[PDB]
Design a protein around this ligand. Structure first.
Ligand code: SF4
Ligand code: SF4
Lengths: 531, 532
């Protein structure tokens, strides 16, 4: 009466649908042998270093076809808004710059994640984590990427690790003699838009599920640089299993799952509800960051088994920096997913002078409604999470708001490393919402009247800007390389150099595009679509 | 300049601090060999079946010493409330019944979870998942446990799998030639109290973190049968990694981690903030289910590295059905964590309510007493939980009346485990009340569900409903499923929806069934102060 049924039963478990290139000469790192009557594979662990290094290098300069096609679709669709087409065009041009292999597509070169599946008879010597980490260390050290990992010395005292380690290394034991991988360079912004809900049987009917989807998609907002790959997971054997599944779904790792369930409780993709998610996304009007039809590229919906008392639900996105690479090691050597090296084939405002007293800039901005596209020229002061926290602490000790918070618009950003001979490394915005708790306080103390970042912000910021005569400008989110190449002319570290990328910077920009998102009158260009 | 630093650096990676027993003769399942100059271990996969079968049998009848010590502490502490002592005593007595090996400690015998760590040179033949699942299948089929897993035939159509499969099988590739395990039989109620928050650097200061902890602990409420083992994880490399870590922390799997961080970003336990979690838990007044000091057994707090832009936070509990077992396979055979077989050594006023009356007379008697009053129920309960409620609501939406059997007796939210031979009932404790909250006003407006019996605090809509309709919510003690079955439940019959499993509608006769009046017919709620 016993019948074993794996939860996940992909029809393409080895991802034959993906194109791979072999690393030249890599057959020298492997040797097929036969032990106690079974086929095995000896793998020199140096292969793991070589592979991780190449994967976490390549992935910052190239994209998958389903990602690129999405941007082309947003540009060619008659039903797309002007803002849809503008954002999609900008991201594709950004991808073209990144394919030059010098600037990464986003300044946030992400957390390094490895899903590895080592066969029972795949023998590495066992030091996989160290050799994988060395390859990751190599990728981030010798390329123009960014060190984004923050170590906790105690509960509150932190420092940058200075090398983008530690990685997330999930190494699984599986049948056979090969070694298979999914590498993810996961941006913090989209990592933050991974949500867990604890629901019940009361959710599990068409009317309730539909309303739930409408509600939760809005809470994604524009803060992770849409168009999104949206993943939804209904059910799961535990919260952590539900969240792992929604991550992998967003990476299209589970695309070959069955599309029907059975009495043994197997997982399945649900194309019907994928279509419903896409309809909700399109009809939301949220669009590709600034209103329109292209809130989402595509959707993945996986239904999982559940304990009778439980219904975990996971929602997550892959952002404009859509970065994953499949790979495997076998008797012929090292194979790595081939990304699109020619993104160009997918390609078919008010001037604001910052070189004035900031009150003059505020005055000019006040003349325009939210939704107005502006082009910024001049000085930006750059500060994000830790600098804001330090500055609040200083003021709490009676010290003044620093002068540099009062002279210029505040750009929330952290740069990637500067290539030799370049003015700037990749240098796009980080998410505005994380700084919301500082705005009223800083404005009340005569600073941060104008901020520049991406994403919708909370009502406290709208109220602050109305009370103090302030403004929030939304940069396009994602196009870090073209911004660095065309707009950023000079970069200087101003304060807190120990914070690395999170130091305060002073930069000079030309033709820097943005939208007026919040004005000085109580208006918010997201108030209709993200209410 | 490259330095490798594992995120997790336990000082006791093989859990030498845990006591293990050897499965007799099990060295016959393993053989030491050497290939290419390296030591390897051949393991007959039947060992995985044997091990999983024993783990998922044992864990339902015995507990760890640190769990039992917590209950004793709740009894002997002068600062424990009278209700703390009463609840802890009941749970300890329940444990004594469970140790007889016939009745499981909770009716919710849980999801079967396996964390396995297979050495590079540990060779099983590779069919680990099947052989582990067969052992799990054995444990739930041949013992008086419960089939709790719900398969989705399509997005909305569901059926019970009938065998408590599928399991969650997380098999990791690690160095060496052994096979190490953590088995968890995870109740749905405590699984539901695993929460992910997406926070920021603005959280990371003493004042903000303290206020945050105060706020979130209350949202745990009493719906997962406290005293809790509370785990809190600050940071993490991804949401799923944060949630995995908070699960393992709640199982005390990470107890031997370092207690300081470093510039390489290693994980650490934080004893100071563990103490603060316990102070918040104690000062909350929430108590062991019904007011007092013993909201929590103990706390685990793990600080993790984070992306500069991110701060995932995980909060989770282990409930009164605290069920995990460590194990390992090596050249000497199969070893399994030894649990406490004699819980009795840890062991150091109510209104009688006759339910065999018209329900309107019962409502009248209940109306005489304030919330917090202890009652003893005698007579008939109609049993129905999540799926039965959904089916009945569906019927009413199609114009059918509320069935008569929903009007004649109090409604007990529960799903029983299988009945042992010669027993009146298998383990049969309460289900979380909050999950049925959306049905109460509707059912009461149609003349039924005036009196409900389950566990956990409920939402304001239920308080309002009971005041509008002259209703009551009674809180059973959460957890003591075995002693309820042995002492209180006298007869069980299936009344409706036989196609459902443990989730059919049942009619049961009970005696001396203890409960508290949690919500009355006047707008009062005994949790309104502590869970506000
Ligand atoms: S594309 Fe946007 S959300 Fe994604 S990593 Fe870059 S800044 Fe963050
Ligand atoms: S002890 Fe309570 S929360 Fe835990 S499984 Fe049993 S009923 Fe659910």
């Amino acid at each position: 009466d016993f019948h074993f049924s794996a939860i996940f039963q992909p029809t393409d478990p080895h991802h034959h649908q993906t194109e791979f290139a072999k690393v030249e000469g890599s057959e020298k790192y492997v040797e097929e042998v036969e032990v106690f009557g079974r086929q095995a594979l000896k793998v020199n662990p140096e292969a793991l270093t070589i592979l991780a290094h190449r994967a976490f290098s390549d992935v910052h300069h190239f994209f998958r076809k389903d990602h690129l096609e999405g941007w082309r679709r947003a540009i060619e669709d008659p039903e797309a808004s002007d803002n849809d087409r503008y954002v999609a065009t900008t991201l594709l041009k950004n991808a073209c710059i990144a394919a030059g292999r010098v600037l990464p597509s986003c300044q946030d070169t992400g957390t390094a994640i490895v899903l590895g599946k080592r066969g029972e008879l795949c023998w590495t010597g066992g030091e996989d984590e160290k050799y994988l980490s060395k390859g990751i260390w190599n990728a981030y050290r010798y390329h123009n990427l960014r060190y984004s990992q923050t170590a906790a010395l105690d509960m509150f005292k932190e420092c940058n690790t200075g090398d983008n380690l530690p990685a997330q290394l999930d190494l699984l034991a599986v049948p056979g003699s090969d070694y298979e991988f999914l590498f993810i360079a996961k941006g913090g912004g989209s990592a933050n838009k991974a949500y867990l809900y604890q629901e019940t049987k009361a959710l599990l009917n068409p009317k309730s599920l539909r309303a739930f989807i409408e509600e939760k998609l809005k809470t994604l907002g524009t803060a992770a640089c849409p168009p999104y790959h949206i993943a939804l997971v209904i059910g799961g054997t535990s919260a952590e299993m539900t969240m792992k599944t929604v991550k992998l779904a967003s990476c299209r790792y589970y695309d070959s799952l069955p599309t029907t369930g059975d009495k043994y409780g197997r997982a399945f993709r649900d194309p019907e509800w994928e279509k419903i998610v896409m309809e909700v996304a399109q009809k939301s009007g949220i669009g590709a960051q600034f209103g329109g039809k292209y809130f989402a590229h595509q959707a993945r919906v996986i239904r999982l088994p559940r304990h009778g008392a439980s219904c975990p639900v996971g929602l997550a996105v892959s952002c404009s920096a859509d970065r994953q690479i499949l790979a495997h090691i076998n008797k012929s050597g090292i194979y790595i997913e081939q990304l699109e090296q020619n993104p160009a084939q997918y390609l078919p405002s008010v001037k604001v002078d910052l070189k004035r007293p900031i009150d003059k800039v505020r005055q000019q901005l006040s003349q325009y409604p939210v939704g107005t596209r502006v082009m910024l020229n001049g000085t930006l002061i750059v500060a994000r999470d830790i600098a804001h926290a330090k500055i609040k602490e200083m003021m709490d000790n009676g010290e003044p708001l620093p002068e540099y918070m009062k002279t210029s618009p505040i750009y929330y950003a952290g740069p990637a490393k500067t290539p030799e001979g370049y003015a700037s490394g990749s240098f796009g915005p980080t998410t505005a919402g994380r700084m919301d708790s500082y705005v009223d306080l800083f404005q009340s103390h005569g600073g941060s009247y104008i901020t520049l970042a991406k994403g919708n912000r909370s009502k406290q910021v709208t109220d602050a800007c109305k009370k103090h005569g302030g403004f929030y400008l939304g940069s396009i989110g994602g196009p870090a390389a073209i911004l660095a190449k065309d707009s950023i002319k000079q970069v200087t570290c101003l304060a807190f150099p120990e914070l690395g990328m999170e130091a305060v910077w002073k930069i000079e920009v030309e033709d820097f595009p943005a939208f007026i998102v919040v004005d000085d009158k109580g208006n918010d260009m997201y108030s209709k679509t993200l209410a």
